[PDB]
Amino acid sequence: TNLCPFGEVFNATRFASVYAWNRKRISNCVADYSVLYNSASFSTFKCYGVSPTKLNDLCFTNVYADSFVIRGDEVRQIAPGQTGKIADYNYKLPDDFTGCVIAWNSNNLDSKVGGNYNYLYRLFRKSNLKPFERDISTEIYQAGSTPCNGVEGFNCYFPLQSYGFQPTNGVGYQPYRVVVLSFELLHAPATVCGP
Amino acid sequence: SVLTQPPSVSGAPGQRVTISCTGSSSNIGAGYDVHWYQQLPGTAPKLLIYGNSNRPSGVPDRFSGSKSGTSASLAITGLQAEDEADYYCQSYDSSLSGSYVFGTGTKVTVLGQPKAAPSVTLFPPSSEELQANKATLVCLISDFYPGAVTVAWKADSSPVKAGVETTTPSKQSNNKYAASSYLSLTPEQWKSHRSYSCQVTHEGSTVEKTVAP
Amino acid sequence: ALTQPASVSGSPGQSITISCTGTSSDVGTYNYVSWYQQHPGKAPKLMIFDVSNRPSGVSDRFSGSKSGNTASLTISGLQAEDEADYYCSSFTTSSTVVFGGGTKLTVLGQPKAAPSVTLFPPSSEELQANKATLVCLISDFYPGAVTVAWKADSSPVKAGVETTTPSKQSNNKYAASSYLSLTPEQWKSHRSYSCQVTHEGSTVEKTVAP
């Protein structure tokens, strides 16, 4: 009769950077979604594949929660089929994604006067990330023909930057916290279902 | 912010015309699309183009749209008699809690008939109104095409702007446009001078009318 | 490094071309040559970046050219606010910045001014504390070139002379100071001393006696 640790993810103290998003596997508990789609606190609750009304009355095999923080002008890229820097180098969603993406502003908990450089993100890479691929390498990206072999300079950059979060930025540059709940349907007796 | 548009574009039937909606680094500089709406005279705005490249059902094949850099462009090839309306461009903005912004608006009118020469006439205040502590000069213009006319009021050697008003050009049953301009002042200000005048300008053609006691 | 001329002088309204000669690995490969200006007693200001483009707030009187392995800075319409130190810099192929030898622009057109010399003997407290210092102050002269000499009644004084470098005042003129350190016995042993300044062939002497 245990309850799913939904509060441990949404009310968490700190979120990981977008480049290395956190991952939480939820199972063996009863899921009560009435709190989610009736909270009036999330600024985005898009669902692809199902609807918030029917989502509660449908059994799920497994569920994964990927939480991160991205700037305001990059929340429109977390969707199946979209492209961009975040959609090819940081977080790539599959084309047959069946799940939901919650998002809410956090301009009062992830900001500080002078700049907050604790949230990193990848900018340069060789190829595009596969669906649900994680990369935490910090090697020097090579853009030219000459091999830099680990020294920075011309044609050799650092593939990790960070946003300058400040409390005086526009809504496009404000740090929004995003949580993607994916439902990987497999062959299982549906251990987790709603009332 | 706001989106800039040309105030008026015209042409002949069977000719390609284009309207340009220029944004900024926030409106179109980001990955925000731009939509095009068409509003007929006296009706609610209709969705003409969505997503800056697609087209909803009902819209013919003539209307096209394409964006580049920080500016979009709508194109109409082969104008008809059904494409005289207003056109607006819309996109989102992300700045200090940005909001949806619209374009200035472009009035597309097909030149079915060529230009003409308008007739103008000034009427001064009557004696009943002169004694009624009220005065107004009216400069009326009729039979002009298209609808682009300005009127300026001038005393003996100086253009005046206190009390000017001009009505929006309206259409009559003969397909020609008419309008009027009012200069409302007190009787003593008019009686204390020698002459007044209304000057009308339509497509460069300038006509004068002077009134004196 | 990059070789620049020592000093260039020109008349107002004319044009001066400063040539910064680099290397096939500095100015031959990349086109990132920059020209900075530094005033006496201030931080160097960025004047030209991008051998063609000029940042906001800069006038059109300055321009930059490049042909082969030698950059050039063309200044037209000389004024009084142009005399400063100009430096050319560039980025090598190994991601390393290299600066030039520095060029000094002396805008010709200013008049010649004779120096004013003030001579002060050692005070009573100086000899009361077993010390002696003669002071020779030079002010309001141009250009910044002047030699100093100390003369006893019939002899030169070479040991015990401290002379500073000429510096520019607020009114675009120069000034300097010289100190002669001696003991009260040597100060009271001779009859008189003199400070002599030499500037552009002219000479001015000032004498002092107890």
Added chain:
Amino acid sequence: EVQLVESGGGLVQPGRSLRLSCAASGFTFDDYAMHWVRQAPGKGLEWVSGISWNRGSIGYADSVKGRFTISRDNAKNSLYLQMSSLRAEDTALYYCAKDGERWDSVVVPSARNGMDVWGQGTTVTVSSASTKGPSVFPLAPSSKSTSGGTAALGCLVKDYFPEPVTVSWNSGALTSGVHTFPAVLQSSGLYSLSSVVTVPSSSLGTQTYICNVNHKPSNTKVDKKVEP
């Protein structure tokens, strides 16, 4: 089929408060987002505010942020807008639109598909002045307004509120040659128009002309003679 009808419109003196409603039918009102779009008389469109699927994402314009309050109730499939502290600029025509995505936001939206269905429009007029009757003055011909053998003369109505006013000539017996132009807003916030007629000057000295003005807001019925 998709239609939105807005009620609750009228004239209110500045400073008061109004409530503009908007119903919906023929689609799932529970999902799509709603927006308010106002347009000044003879001007371009303008955004007002917007809600999206819940009270979580609510946006307001940069000029009506602290005045207008938008709400909605999914039970009755309708939305509301409570305006207060109105000024001389709020007079316009309002439309309640909807988004083109099922769960699109308003504060950081994915701007795609635009706004498909628009409302018919509801007028909101804010005039501090009170209603009154029209003043009528005759515009008589002279030696300067003669051209083509046809002189023009008429009657000018001014300083009335609100629209409209009916004007006739000779109690309807004279039909040809009449020209009535729409009234224009004055500086004081009222209307003024003129009804003119162009007649051959050969009948100026034989037949008299009477202009009749009728106005319902003040029950004004006035006949005036226009003589040289």
Added chain:
Amino acid sequence: QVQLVQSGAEVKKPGASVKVSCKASGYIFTGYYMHWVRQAPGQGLEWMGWINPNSGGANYAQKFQGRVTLTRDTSITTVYMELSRLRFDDTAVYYCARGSRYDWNQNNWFDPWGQGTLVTVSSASTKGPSVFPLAPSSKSTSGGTAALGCLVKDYFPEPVTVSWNSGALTSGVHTFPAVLQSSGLYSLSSVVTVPSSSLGTQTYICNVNHKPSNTKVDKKVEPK
């Protein structure tokens, strides 16, 4: 707006170690390389090296390959430059500048620059100044204007603040630059020109304040 600030001037001894801090404010601190430029007194500019405040790498010149250290601190957005094993040729002004962009494409110029910090390496210890009145005489006056002043000798380090009547007298004051003697002690003189009447009826007092030696001394310049 963007800006860079440095620390105050420093004075050390041969064999010590200096550490200059540079704080950037007004832009993304971790998106632009930080260069250091050293300038000797009366000499051309010299390039020391650059540091990346994003990852932590740094590249120094061949001359300073062994006795320099560049570190970063993103919590307070500062960059530290430590110079160890100082010598007599290490006295200079150290500017910190914003260099290239994160991809070496857009920005390739040093802008903006810092305010400039000075590092004076010397062997002489902190010594209090000595004030002496250079009094006027009948031979040091011509046309009705006599010169008189105060001489500050044998002090270290720089600078010193000389005023006249708490800043009241300003018409005709001249403070010449401080000379460097062969013993490491500085000496300067501040003079004023005054009409002869105020030389007979007004007594002038010069106030010398040396903050590094917390000294404040008044001296009355009377006719000899």
